[PDB]
């Protein structure tokens, strides 16, 4: 799986998170957020 969001709102909700927010999954109404099983986006890009 890779992170996906029906709307930018939930994407901003996890963008605010300092670490580990991408691993969680959330489903508001018919909108949903697939979790990222491997937080490489949290690290491999941010690790620099």
């Amino acid at each position: 799986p890779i992170l996906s969001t029906t709307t930018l709102a939930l994407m901003e909700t996890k963008l605010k998170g300092g670490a580990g927010a991408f691993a969680t999954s959330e489903t508001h109404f018919g909108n949903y957020v697939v979790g990222e099983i491997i937080p490489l986006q949290q690290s491999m890009l941010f690790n620099s």
Partner: protein, 49 residues
């Protein structure tokens, strides 16, 4: 990898796990998941339709 888009969730068992977070403005377009915002190799968002 793979990313779903367009999946519906049942209304009879639909729910709100994050009422405390976002407060979406009501619109029929926000109900059906026509699009799935994603990512790029650089951090960003990548819309698809």
């Amino acid at each position: 990898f793979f990313f779903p888009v367009g999946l519906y969730l049942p209304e009879d068992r639909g729910y709100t796990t994050v009422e405390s977070k976002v407060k979406l403005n009501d619109t029929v377009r926000n109900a059906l998941p026509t699009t799935a915002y994603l990512l790029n190799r650089d951090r960003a968002v990548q819309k698809i339709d």
